[PDB]
Paper text:
We show that DMFase from [name] strain DMF is a halophilic and thermostable enzyme comprising a multimeric complex of the α2β2 or (α2β2)2 type. The Fe3+ ion in the active site catalyzes the hydrolytic cleavage of the amide bond in DMF.
The mutants Y440A and [name] were catalytically inactive. Structures of these mutant enzymes determined by cryoEM show a loss of Fe atoms.
Numbering used by the authors:
A (entry chain A), B (entry chain C): 1 to 410, 416 to 465, 471 to 761
C (entry chain G), D (entry chain E): 156 to 310
E (entry chain D): 8 to 95, 101 to 131
Amino acid sequence: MKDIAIRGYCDRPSVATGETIRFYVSANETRGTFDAELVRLIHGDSNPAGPGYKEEAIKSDLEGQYPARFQRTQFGSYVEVADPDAGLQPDGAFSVHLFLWSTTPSRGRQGIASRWNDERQSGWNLAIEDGRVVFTIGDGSGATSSVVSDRPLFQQIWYSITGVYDPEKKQLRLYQKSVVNRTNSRFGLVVPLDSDCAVSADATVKAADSETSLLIAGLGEAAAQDGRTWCIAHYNGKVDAPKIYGCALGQDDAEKLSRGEIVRPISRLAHWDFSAGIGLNGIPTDHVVDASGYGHHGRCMNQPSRGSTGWNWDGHEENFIHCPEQYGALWFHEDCLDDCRWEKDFEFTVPEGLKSDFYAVKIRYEDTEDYIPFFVLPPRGTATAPILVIASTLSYLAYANEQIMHKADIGHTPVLNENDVELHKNLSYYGLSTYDGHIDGRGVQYTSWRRPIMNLRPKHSIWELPADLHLIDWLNHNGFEYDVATEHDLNDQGAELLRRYKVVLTGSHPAYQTWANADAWEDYLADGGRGMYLAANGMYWIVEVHPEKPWVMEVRKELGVTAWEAPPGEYHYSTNGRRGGRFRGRARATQKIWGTGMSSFGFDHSGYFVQMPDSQDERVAWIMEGIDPEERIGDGGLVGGGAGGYELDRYDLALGTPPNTLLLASSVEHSVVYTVIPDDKAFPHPGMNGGEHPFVRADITYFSTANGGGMFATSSISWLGSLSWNDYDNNVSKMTKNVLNQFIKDEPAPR
Amino acid sequence: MKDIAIRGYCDRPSVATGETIRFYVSANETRGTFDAELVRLIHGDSNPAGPGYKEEAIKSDLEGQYPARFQRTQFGSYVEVADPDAGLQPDGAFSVHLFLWSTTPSRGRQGIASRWNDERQSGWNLAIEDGRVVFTIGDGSGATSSVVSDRPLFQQIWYSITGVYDPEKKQLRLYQKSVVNRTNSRFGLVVPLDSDCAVSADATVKAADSETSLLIAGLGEAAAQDGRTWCIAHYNGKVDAPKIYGCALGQDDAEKLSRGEIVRPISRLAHWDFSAGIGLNGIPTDHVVDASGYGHHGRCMNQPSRGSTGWNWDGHEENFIHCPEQYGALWFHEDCLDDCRWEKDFEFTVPEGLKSDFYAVKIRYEDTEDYIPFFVLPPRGTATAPILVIASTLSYLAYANEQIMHKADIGHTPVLNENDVELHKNLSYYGLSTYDGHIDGRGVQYTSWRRPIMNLRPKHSIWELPADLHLIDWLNHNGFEYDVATEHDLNDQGAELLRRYKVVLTGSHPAYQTWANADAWEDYLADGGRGMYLAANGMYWIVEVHPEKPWVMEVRKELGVTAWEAPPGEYHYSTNGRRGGRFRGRARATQKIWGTGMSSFGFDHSGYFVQMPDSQDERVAWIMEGIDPEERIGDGGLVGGGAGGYELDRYDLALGTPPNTLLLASSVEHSVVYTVIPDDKAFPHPGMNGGEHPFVRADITYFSTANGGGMFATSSISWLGSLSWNDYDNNVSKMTKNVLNQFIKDEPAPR
Amino acid sequence: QIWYSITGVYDPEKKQLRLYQKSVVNRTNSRFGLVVPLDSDCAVSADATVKAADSETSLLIAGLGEAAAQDGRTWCIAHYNGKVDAPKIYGCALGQDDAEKLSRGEIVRPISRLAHWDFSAGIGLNGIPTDHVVDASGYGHHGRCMNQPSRGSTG
Amino acid sequence: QIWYSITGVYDPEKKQLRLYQKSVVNRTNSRFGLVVPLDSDCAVSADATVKAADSETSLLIAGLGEAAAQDGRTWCIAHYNGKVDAPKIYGCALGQDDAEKLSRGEIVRPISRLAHWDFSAGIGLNGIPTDHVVDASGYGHHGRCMNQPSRGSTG
Amino acid sequence: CVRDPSNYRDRSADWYAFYDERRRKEIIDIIDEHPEIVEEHAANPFGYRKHPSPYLQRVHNYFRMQPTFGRYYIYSEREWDAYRIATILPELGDERFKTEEEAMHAVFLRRIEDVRAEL
């Protein structure tokens, strides 16, 4: 079919003047060259009923031909303990104990702990194959020796597994024992569970040096070429405190290990504590500590979930920073990705005479155009405009590589294209999204910029970079001079970024903010700053950018407008130790800063605004200026079919709308598809729907702040998609143009 | 209409042999005598389509005549600091600083901190009248001086307020200043809030000794007869850290007090820290510590909310046991009631020869029969029957005085009687329920036994004590010899209570349990114990009985099958510093013990069960003994007209149902009004109803445990109501009787 | 200066007072260490003739009440010198196995307690700046330090 | 023994070397306190007349590489004496406002780091019993303490 | 500035007035264009083994969520055998009823008359 043959990404989302961005490109097979050139994105939405696709080409020092090639991607979570000297390949006896929690115990061959080679069958591994636990040694001749558990594992049940090799008796052994209590495992203590065993086997071969690294939750593929060990047989579920001894262990000693007790502490070789480094600021590191004192430190790879519930967890503390001794597990999925680790193809250092706007590098392969978007900032410490436009990159990372077709293998018949069929065909090159879930049933918490985000390209509810190019095209079609920042840069710079501008606009779906973004907006509006919020669902989810990996973003979700909920002890972030669920449950609701906040949502079509009795107040005779007081504000539009639809925010004084807020209009004609969000339901009952409940509405509001500041909010997604209707001649664009011409002037906003 | 003229309560829910219960009775006016006698409750429901009301009279040392009198009820939260020596009535200058978070700031005259007499205008009070903080002193001659603030208070905004009396200038002063931040108040920092004043007035009187106690959140009514001070003008909302200084402050000094600084420490007369006492076990006491070092230790009355959010709460810690210096407030409603403090009219020691069952004292006044239900236990450490019946007392306290008619002032047009209009007519005598809310809008957390509970009475879904009398009448009609415990007693005794009995039968709606109750059930069913769960919605909420006051129950709710939701930083219980929302979110879901857990609720009628293919199984042919496999199980009942309805529990392995569980039947024919509970929802899409979603069903299950144990679950509230249909000739009583005759034998339950 | 765990039992059924002393030294807490052959444990008993009447005073740690409390003040006479760690009162007689379990730092019969004063309740990250002693059992019998004993001592 | 925040910038767009020295004394960290009128702050600049070529050595905190790394071992010659707290390399050219923000402990421009060694990452309740240095910028440029400097020193 | 809570009011109540107006017109159109749902609810007001029509269910979902739903309780004394309709200390009605299905349907008719009386 129309097969995508070229991919790419940036290392960083936003680049100011005088600093360097890199581009990492991969084709399906290593042949040929590819063209590259820089464009300026103006309007991305290629609906023929609207303005059409627009781009401006820039004569840069970036273009030319570059050799296309293929770049392999590691895909799955593990912990790589690098060992060049084969110190974790003992010669005599050795024993491996770990606590295990398998979430898919029958999905193929799954390696738990290994220092293994799989081209030649050499080394040792402790793996899950055929539903059982198998402990194997090999020497490289193709000859192995395995010991297989009598009792297979259960799904999501804690087990304490010891694997013993003993050269004196020439014998492999294996001690499985299930360690459930009232709270940790899938079912509880009322089962008559007999899943303990103690088996043994004859050893014929020795464990040879595998010439790889030790891996948790995976097997080494071949010997490490150029110091990189690939990983193959990935694992799904928790591993708690693995350890290697340099001695054979009995059954009494494995029984003592099963109760959480470090036996023979001079006979250890390694003991990775997964809860070493938990402070009062979470565990913002990808570093795993050898707790024994032999220096065999590890490194988390592709971001497994730190701060997970461990084997000794009883529900008396549910914040991992206050009981780190019961939170020593990593979750280890098989479909994680924080970085594709490709090689750089070309880099670009931004010139001096380049206007701050939305840019992309258009890459032309044989029969495929590919765009790699990035945002160019103004120079550092300056402001080349009176208007700032916040690009909602944290919600670009939320929906990043969102897979609709892959949700059918775990309304209104969703329309797909050639980008989504590559997301389904190559999961391993792209990753998942926070609206998805892993194959274990847990939602994706971590998401990343350093991967090809296939639904971020400008062409083809839209993919939310075209939905911001709506606003960009409206600003360029009028005579407005604007800058561009991102939510990562607002996180970095605080309100100091915002105070350089007379008015800061908002992207079309700003749903995932950090806590410091909310502080920056609050401190900005509290002293003189103006702002527009031309969107809905605007401060719903709390998000933290990772401190060691700033391209990685963490969210953890709960009951609300969600796709998944966090499991029952794990509501706190790894990156900082704070709660961070949704903003409303922290008493920083969206109404408290921006006037309105999330009220209802649905998926079929849109409505239109009807003028409220505050429309005829003369204090807002500047907003409702060239608009007749009997018209429908926003009937017709590119997104859904109207201006008020698909998500809505409402006026609410009980959540923190300022008392002087005026209520200008509200949206009507919403179907029974739309529903009141679960945040508002005490008892659910029928009639909690659109048209049958008074919380299904958008609300256009204005309020003034101190020192000549103000805030205008329109409370719907499709407001920006309605701006170019009827060739820019409608009530939506006239209202938005009135408020933007008022906000950029050299006088206080009215009261 | 009918006017209830006689009221009463016990001091405790349950009494064993040889120990004393005390009955506290109050009439309208002090005249005449009332009769009393002891009855045994058999069947409570007086539906003429059923068995009708049944009881048995008992000769005892109780019956006679007693002088009927009126007994006055103190109503509403406050803090009573006793002061005999008039140490907190200064002769010179004094000042009063406190923080303030008013929720109903325009509901009449509300006293905040006072040492005041309201009969003769003497003492000093800091109060709110006409929306404004008013500082008033008086001398007993009826003449008062008062200073009134310029700015009225905003609702739920934090204010620092300082009232100064200054005899050197003969001047009253008042320093009001608002202390909003991002997280503590109703609206944030973007408002241009101007609610600060420094007013002054002349002192024309002095301050005389009021001869009362110092009252936070209220005013003393009259002089302290018998050492008890009555409180009249009850304040609604938080008060954080009051203090009295023995000097006259300034404006700079009030500005320093506005920031949390304790100025002039040696000049304090009293300083109550409401957060001193918070440890890792919470704050399980009603003691208030004088942090100024003078022994003026207060006492919380009528249970205000310990562990509430203070004025300095930025939302970084949401557990009060871990940051207790930001949790120094106390909510103080006006319609709290934990204890009526009435005088004992008569007492009753249980004789040696008395069977353990449900009992009550029938009081016959002029035209009104009122009952006072209590529970007689077996002797301590023994057991007199092979069947134990658990009376669900904690979910009697949940629904205690549940005021349907009072909810309008905050389906199916609810039916009432004279017990409801007495609740509506005398709110001060009865109190509220955990489904109710306060007048502050926040739902009621603490509920109490020591008060007349009007829907505990056996006559007249039903009031949940007749719903247990359904089971008691079914047991008495057959030849089963049983004992009766309560959930308070299971809380006290542990699994040692349960292990004395072969089978243990759960009540009709056991929805509220403590954590140790579930531990005791799990340790009972794990090791040989047998049980029956004849109900739905069985282990939903977590409850903690108060340690000092074993008649008071705490619950704090959240999103789910709820009426109210806790405000953001106030999720952790005062009595034990532990999370305790729903059981399902603490990884101890109802499936993990009993086999089925909550799936859907509704409020119109009930449905019938349809047998699954596991009903034809040969292992459970003993359950389905007299039942033809083409029948409907329970089509017709005294509750909703069917055996499955009004709340439904389902089978779910992902929540912890044991794997050897056999699914016997399932309920059908549920209306569109049966919604799916908000726990099971990711995105609310239309169709979350009965007849359309696959989660609206009940599930009759059975699983066997170790040592000959087992658990039979029926997943419906109306199952006990369907027992007596067709004059005890139905499928419901045959199934219950088959499983109960199997469970009472000496052989193990079948596997 | 040697740590001991002392239980005193009164039992009206057998009409008997008992007393369980046991020394609990380890490497660091006491005056001398674990190299001594210390035999200072005992378990004695005596016959009871009288009942314990109401003394009309307050409970005192490290002292005896002098006379009955006139105007709510209880004087103190036979003062004590040295540490007392976690005192507790039960409402039941205790055996020797149960006092042995108490000696290892273990709250036996937690529904049979009457009082348990935790001298390390309220230690935060700002020290313990209070003269308040908490009844840890949950019966509300809170105490009050008088004449400032050293909080934050080694137990 | 005074604490200084120091930032050295190379800037090829202007062909300019810069250096931002600023003293960060407080009450407790330095040799003398806040009462001194300490003036030891500078923002100087000069012209870049060469480029930076690959030295073919290792990166050395507290020293200079002697010659090119024969056999993978780099010899260190000009040994520094005294504390170094949290070095970092940025892949861009900073300013004076940005060096002022770095002077306060803020990690400015996190996505532009090339390496950032936290010398305190690894401290647990067992101390820091290792000579590993963690690259806190997420690039695997993990150092290695040689000849045992004093871990757990005052920052 | 914002300095007095009497100058400010919940402006959402403007939209509640507009919403209640359009919702009342919708409901009386549904009742006048479907007059068999009254007979339907008279036959079986609980829906016991015969679930309501979507239009009857829509009229229920309008009635069962208004702030005026707090009127019209059904009262029944313990030593009485009839049902009366309380009205908001309530005011008891005068018309006795044998069964409570009759009382619930009379409350349904009286609510339809009340929603007609406001238009």
